[PDB]
């Protein structure tokens, strides 16, 4: 059957433009869609349908096969919320993700909602009008899909949830997250076991990331410049740790000495510093994850394939922070790196709070939109805006535990 679904009141179907695609991707898509058409999963539509959603194709990791991807961000934003989170995986030793997008195709979609899922396969040089379709089943990448399939999902897993109430399983979108403390040996087998349990009907390490300290410089001899830079970082720091003191230091900096000038540290100053090092040894107090408010992800490009991020719902009250060292292959590609980055981070938030954060990407919209798809690999698409990395915030996070 199929349960009636609706858009939140007042709202209407997405009418988002199709970004142009590469031939390679188009052929792939056309192929995919035609097959899916035959199977009756989707159907060509007419002009009376004025809605549209972007689509593209991405080859999965360790796969040479083209996967069709749709951006229902807008649509999801508009579909009625359905009111239907584990702290386990958060703490688990190891987690693996499962793509159950297929599950969804089995189930049909309310006929009256189908219109909204209209999407468009573009043609090169505008030579031919585009190829328009709409789903007949529950589409992948739709928030309504996991919801309507929720029920069936449970029973499907029960026999394992019961056979293994020692393991955890959180579902999010076309994703299935599972984490145990068993060694990768007895682990992969249970995963692959479960995996089979599913095929029947038809790594990660959460214990290694949370937040890091702000290591501070430490030299033999300090020059005016050195001292200044330091003071700069601290002052800003104080915003998180109001206990941070910078007087003793700021004294040494009195006069108009050349930057290169070397300066000896007041024993008074040494204490000052010492006290700040002490403080900065641990994440500040009073940081709570509020679920009523949105989760934020700031990312700074540190250069040399280096990238630093902070997740927070409120400024200077990060919940987590980290670094990310580019993967051998992006030897010269910033966009590749950033994407990968963005990806990990989203993935983590899911694990943690099982909820996607909104990004603040240090990159032109133009750039990001011409290529992001070309490196993307995930059933989901987070929210994002583009910004101008404030020079301060960088010099600060550049100072992370190395």
What residues are paired with 301 via a beta bridge? 307
Residues 246-265 that bind other proteins (CB under 8 A): 246-247, 250-251, 253-261
Residue 80 vs 248, nearer CB to other proteins = 248
Q: What is the dihedral of CA 45, 141, 190, 341, to 10 degrees?
A: 140
Applying CB under 8 A, among 146, 206, 322, 362 the residue interacting with other proteins is: 362
Q: What is the dihedral of CA 356, 144, 98, 339, to 10 degrees?
A: -40
175 is in an annotated binding site: yes
Residue 390 as a binder of other proteins (CB under 8 A): the answer is yes
166 is in an annotated binding site: no
Whether 171 and 153 have beta carbons less than 8 Å apart is answered as yes
110 is in an annotated binding site: no
- Please count the other Cβ atoms lying within 10 Å of the Cβ belonging to residue 378: 21
Q: How far is the CB of 331 from other proteins (least distance, A)?
A: 11
The secondary structure of the chain in percent helix, strand, coil, rounded to multiples of 5, reads 35, 20, 45
Binding mask 141-170 for other proteins (x = CB under 8 A): ------------------------------
Q: How far apart are CA 15 and CA 119, in angstroms?
A: 9
Which SS3 state, helix, strand or coil, does residue 94 take? strand
Long-range contacts of 62-67 (CB under 8 A, 24+ apart): 66/25, 66/28, 66/29, 66/31, 66/32
Residue 297 vs 361, nearer CB to other proteins = 361
Q: How far apart are CA 28 and CA 38, in angstroms?
A: 16
Number of H helices, E strands in the chain: 12, 15
Residue 292 vs 332, nearer CB to other proteins = 332
Residue 34 as a binder of other proteins (CB under 8 A): the answer is no
Q: How far apart are CA 363 and CA 375, in angstroms?
A: 16
Residue 11 vs 124, nearer CB to other proteins = 124
Residue 235 as a binder of other proteins (CB under 8 A): the answer is yes
Applying CB under 8 A, among 47, 165, 264, 286 the residue interacting with other proteins is: 47
Applying CB under 8 A, among 34, 163, 343, 367 the residue interacting with other proteins is: 367
Stretch that binds other proteins, among 56-64, 75-83, 186-194, 329-337 (CB under 8 A): 329-337
By CB under 8 A, name the binding residues for other proteins: 17-18, 20-24, 26, 46-50, 52, 124-130, 132, 223, 225, 228-229, 231-232, 235-236, 246-247, 250-251, 253-261, 300-301, 303-304, 332-338, 361-364, 366-368, 370-371, 388-392, 394
């Amino acid at each position: 059957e199929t349960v009636p679904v609706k858009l939140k009141p007042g709202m209407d179907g997405p009418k988002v433009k199709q970004w142009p695609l590469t031939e390679e991707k188009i052929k792939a898509l056309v192929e995919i869609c035609t097959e899916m058409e035959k199977e009756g999963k989707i159907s060509k539509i007419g002009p009376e349908n004025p809605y549209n959603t972007p689509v593209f194709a991405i080859k999965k990791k360790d796969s040479t096969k083209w996967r069709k991807l749709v951006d229902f961000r807008e649509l999801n934003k508009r579909t009625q919320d359905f009111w239907e989170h584990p702290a386990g995986l958060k703490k688990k030793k190891s987690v693996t993700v499962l793509d159950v997008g297929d599950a969804y195709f089995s189930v049909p979609l309310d006929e009256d909602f189908r219109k909204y899922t209209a999407f468009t396969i573009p043609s090169i040089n505008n030579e031919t009008p585009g190829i328009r379709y709409q789903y007949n089943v529950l589409p992948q990448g739709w928030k309504g899909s996991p919801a309507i399939f929720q029920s069936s999902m449970t029973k499907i897993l029960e026999p394992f949830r019961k056979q293994n109430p020692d393991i955890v399983i959180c579902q999010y979108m076309d994703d299935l997250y599972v984490g145990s403390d068993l060694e990768i040996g007895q682990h992969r087998t249970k995963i692959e076991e479960l995996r089979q349990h599913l095929l029947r009907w038809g790594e990660l390490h959460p214990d290694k990331w949370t937040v890091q300290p702000i290591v501070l410089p430490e030299k033999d001899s300090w020059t005016v410049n050195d001292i200044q830079k330091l003071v700069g970082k601290l002052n800003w720091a104080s915003q998180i740790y109001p206990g941070i003191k910078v007087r003793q230091l700021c004294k040494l900096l009195r006069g108009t000495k050349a930057l290169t000038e070397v300066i000896p540290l007041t024993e008074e100053a040494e204490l000052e510093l010492a006290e700040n090092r002490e403080i900065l040894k641990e994440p500040v107090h009073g940081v709570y994850y509020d679920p009523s408010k949105d989760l934020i992800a700031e990312i700074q490009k540190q250069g040399q394939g280096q990238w630093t991020y902070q997740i927070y719902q409120e400024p200077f009250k990060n919940l987590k922070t980290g670094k990310y060292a580019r993967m051998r292959g992006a030897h010269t590609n910033d966009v590749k790196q950033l994407t990968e980055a963005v990806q990990k981070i989203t993935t983590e938030s899911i694990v943690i709070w099982g909820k996607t954060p909104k990004f603040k990407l240090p990159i032109q919209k133009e750039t990001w939109e011409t290529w992001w798809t070309e490196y993307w690999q995930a059933t989901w698409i987070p929210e994002w805006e583009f910004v101008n990395t404030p020079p301060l915030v960088k010099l600060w996070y550049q100072l992370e535990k190395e």
